[PDB]
Write a protein that binds this ligand. Structure first.
Ligand SMILES: Nc1ncnc2c1ncn2[C@@H]1O[C@H](COP(=O)(O)OP(=O)(O)OP(=O)(O)O)[C@@H](O)[C@H]1O
Lengths: 49, 404, 360, 48
């Protein structure tokens, strides 16, 4: 019974991990950045170089 | 800061777009048609008063292909627009109206007369629908394919000014496809129940004639009103079912590709196979069609080639680098790619030819209005408006001295 | 600290703090000019010395001084909060002119000195309360009804339909039917008692002709109601003939389509592809959209109207009347929303037009 | 390439969200607000 429970838990853990990874990818899908800061907007911030 | 209290009106062949300058999308979009009842235009205006069945009410269109057909009905359309949708008395807001390039100059004069004299708006301006459609995409050098219900046209614009004589007009438009699907209905016998009577949904499986009942309270409706509503139903059919072949229509390919399903208002449902691919080929090749198939009929690729050719090579390369497709008919599924291949064959690919990407319903229909919104809020453009005190003589002399 | 969620209804003003589940302060959007100035909570009590104005007609602000006073009351009396220390989330009817949004931003930042502001569409906030990525929102508010299709949270302005009957004119029609009953209700107090009668009694019937037959055959529909004057009346057939006016505006005498028909129209106006998803997600919001059985009547109506092939689902949570405020609270509590506020700097440099640059 | 003169996107790095966003170019919208545009370049994955 303990072996069966351990194997079943391994499969449940694997499935939950795959589901969490799918949810994380779905999270990544949305555009992570929409705005920036003001001191990083009107002070030239960078050169192409 | 470049904005003023400007309203952009864009009345095409199907719907009137009213919105404020700077707005991303038109505020309202309700159809060109309008109701009538016995005494003047005792009335019904938008999609909410134009649809409830009524005792012998008749529906007409003050517009035709964009030219005004009844200025009193046009005035009442505008009055209701201002009264409800924009709900601001017009005495303060600058307005710019879009007119089809082929609309008569005298009609522009009479439109200005009506606007200024009656509605007493404090400023005005005119700019053509094709000009505004190219205005939306930010391109000086552009070629526009406008195709609504009643007319399909191709017009080039350079330096923001239309090549006024370079206008191509083709009735192969939304109404062409609508007539084609109408004769389809007749040939395979769709009985077009209007949605406004149905009160039950005893639906049936594929092909079977669905059962239903008509609401007892219904009063008599003039034939024009029923015609309009069933025309809207078949317009929905146009949007849903029609699809365009990538290449020249073929029977075996058209049969091979999976069929599609459409259900009618009463529960009657049917599956379409090769006919939906065949129908737009009629636009791309009028010859195969019934009746409307004479050599006089000009298809989309031939239209673009004719419009491009009639202008000299000092701007034709500019037209090459951007082909812009707008209007309703361009929304038939896979129409734009078919047009692109069609021009790639017709127009020698030897020089730089690009399309300009624009897909959604907002971007095609309202690109005529979006350009007007872009102009109205433009900083330099604020000097161009026809003022009332200017209008006193401008409505006659400067409505042309100013608005090319 | 907390963000202030002030929802400006068409006769009912709702206020509270971001993150709270319900609007703590609810007071009618009344303002009265003596025959000082007083707002609903005290204005409704001061009628004898007062003449009552409404600053919101059909969800669009009528005049700005009265609305200024409504906001002054909201903050300083109802919430007791300092506007200078809290961000303010304002909700305005769909299809509000540009000038009105700009004036709202101006009033807030100038007169009330708010640090951060946002103006959001009421229907989109009701969708947020429902919690659906795409949907069609039927918001029969306090003075106007709006059918708003929303795709990916973006309201499609072209398809939004306005029908100019809702709770208030419905109450007026109930006053008509109640005079037909033989009673009399004309005064403002009597009108409010009819309002209470509407809240307590009426319902949306599942079948009109059937319920006429039932009322004729059976007296069970009659229920008793107690008036402030002390007498008692019975309401039967009226319990649904007035709500029935929603789907047949001809009962009101108005010459427009009904609620379900207008929902069909709005759905049609949208792109064909997303019509199925809108069908699957229909949200009933607003004050007068919470009649009992209204959801099922809608369900049957637009099952009949819509293609039988597409599953229509009516979503009407039990507290849909506040759904706009709950959506505002959810939006203001989000960490991702915090980047969307309009700051004092942004108004100072860009002016009232800033409301259109980042706040649709 | 074709040498278009206006589509001058470039690699850029912000300061507060300090990362290489990829091809982005700066623009002034209405109201004098400086906006960074962007491309969904096929290099998108390389910027880990
Ligand atoms: N999905 C669709 N695909 C193609 N055409 C459609 C679709 N849905 C509706 N239509 C029809 O296409 C036309 C929509 O364009 P519309 O007539 O409004 O153009 P417009 O901007 O007014 O220009 P024009 O001056 O050419 O009339 C109408 O005939 C409408 O019935």
């Amino acid at each position: 019974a303990v072996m069966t429970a351990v194997r079943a838990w391994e499969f449940w853990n694997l499935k939950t991990l795959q589901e969490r990874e799918a949810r994380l990818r779905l999270e990544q899908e949305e555009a992570e950045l929409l705005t920036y800061t003001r001191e990083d907007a009107y002070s030239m911030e960078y050169v192409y170089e | 800061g470049d904005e003023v209290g400007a309203l952009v009106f864009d009345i095409g062949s199907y719907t009137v777009r009213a919105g404020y300058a700077g707005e991303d999308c038109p505020k309202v979009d309700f159809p060109t048609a309008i109701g009538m009842v016995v005494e003047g235009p005792t009335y019904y205006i938008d999609t909410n008063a134009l649809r409830v069945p009524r005792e012998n009410m008749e529906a007409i269109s003050p517009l035709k292909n964009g030219m005004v057909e009844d200025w009193d009905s046009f005035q009442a359309i505008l009055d209701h627009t201002y009264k409800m949708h924009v709900k601001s008395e017009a005495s303060l807001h600058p307005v710019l109206m879009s007119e089809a390039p082929w609309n008569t100059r005298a009609k522009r004069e009479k439109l200005t007369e009506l606007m200024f004299e009656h509605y007493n708006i404090p400023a005005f301006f005119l700019c053509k629908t094709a000009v505004l459609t190219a205005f939306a995409n930010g391109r000086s050098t552009g070629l526009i394919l406008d195709s609504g219900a009643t007319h399909t046209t191709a017009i080039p614009v350079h330096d923001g000014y239309v090549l006024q004589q370079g206008i191509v007009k083709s009735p192969l438009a939304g109404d062409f496809i609508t007539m084609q699907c109408r004769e389809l209905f007749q040939e395979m016998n769709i009985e077009l129940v209007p949605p406004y009577m149905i009160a039950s949904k005893e639906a049936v499986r594929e092909g079977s004639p669905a059962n239903w009942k008509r609401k007892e309270k219904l009063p008599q409706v003039t034939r024009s009103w029923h015609n309009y509503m069933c025309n809207c139903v078949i317009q929905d059919f146009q949007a849903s079912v029609l699809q365009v072949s990538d290449s020249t229509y073929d029977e075996q390919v058209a049969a091979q590709m999976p069929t599609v399903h459409y259900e009618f208002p009463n529960g009657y449902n049917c599956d379409f196979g090769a006919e939906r691919l065949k129908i737009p080929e009629g636009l791309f090749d009028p010859s195969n069609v019934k009746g409307l198939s004479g050599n006089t009929m000009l298809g989309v690729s031939h239209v673009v080639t004719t419009s491009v050719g009639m202008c000299d090579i000092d701007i034709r390369p500019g037209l090459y680098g951007s082909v812009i497709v707008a209007g309703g008919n361009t929304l038939i599924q896979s129409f734009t790619d078919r047009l692109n291949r069609e021009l790639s064959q017709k127009t020698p690919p030897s020089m730089r030819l690009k399309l300009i990407a624009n897909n959604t319903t907002v971007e095609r229909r309202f690109s005529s209005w979006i350009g007007g919104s872009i102009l109205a809020s433009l900083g330099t453009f604020q000097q161009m408006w026809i003022s009332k005190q200017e209008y006193e003589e401008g409505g006659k002399q400067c409505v042309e001295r100013k608005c090319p | 600290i907390a963000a202030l969620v002030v929802d400006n209804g068409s006769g009912m003003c709702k206020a509270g703090f971001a993150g709270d589940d319900a609007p703590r302060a609810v007071f009618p959007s009344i303002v009265g000019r003596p025959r000082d100035s007083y707002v609903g909570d005290e204005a409704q009590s001061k009628r004898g010395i007062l003449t009552l104005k409404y600053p919101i007609e059909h969800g669009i602000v009528t005049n700005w001084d009265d609305m200024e006073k409504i906001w002054h009351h909201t903050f300083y009396n109802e919430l007791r909060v300092a506007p200078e220390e809290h961000p303010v989330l304002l909700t305005e009817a769909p299809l509000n002119p540009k000038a009105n949004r700009e004036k709202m931003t101006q009033i807030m930042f100038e007169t009330f000195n708010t640090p951060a502001m946002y103006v959001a569409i009421q229907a989109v906030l009701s969708l947020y309360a429902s919690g659906r990525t795409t949907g069609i929102v039927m918001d029969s508010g306090d003075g106007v009804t709006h059918t708003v299709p929303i795709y990916e949270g973006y309201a499609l302005p072209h398809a939004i339909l306005r029908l100019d009957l809702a709770g208030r004119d419905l109450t007026d029609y109930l006053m008509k039917i109640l005079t037909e009953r033989g009673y009399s209700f004309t005064t403002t107090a009597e009108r409010e008692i009819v309002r209470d009668i509407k809240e307590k009694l009426c319902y949306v019937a599942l079948d009109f002709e059937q319920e006429m037959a039932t009322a004729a055959s059976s007296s069970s529909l009659e229920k008793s109601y107690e008036l402030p004057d002390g007498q008692v009346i019975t309401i039967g057939n009226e319990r649904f003939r007035c709500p029935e006016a929603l789907f047949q505006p001809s009962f009101l005498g108005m010459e427009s389509c009904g609620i379900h028909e207008t929902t069909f129209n709005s759905i049609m106006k949208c792109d064909v592809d997303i019509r199925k998803d809108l069908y699957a997600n229909t949200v009933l919001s607003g004050g007068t959209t919470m009649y009992p059985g209204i959801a099922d009547r809608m369900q049957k109506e637009i099952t009949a109207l819509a293609p039988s092939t597409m599953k229509i689902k009516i979503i009407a949570p039990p507290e849909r009347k506040y759904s706009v405020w709950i959506g505002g609270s959810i939006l203001a509590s989000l960490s991702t929303f915090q980047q969307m506020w309009i700051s004092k700097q942004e108004y100072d440099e860009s002016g009232p037009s800033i409301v259109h640059r980042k706040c649709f | 390439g074709l040498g278009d003169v206006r589509y001058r996107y470039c690699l850029t790095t912000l300061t507060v969200p300090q990362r290489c966003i990829g091809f982005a170019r700066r623009r002034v919208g209405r109201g004098g607000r400086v906006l960074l545009d962007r491309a969904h370049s096929d290099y998108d994955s390389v910027f880990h």
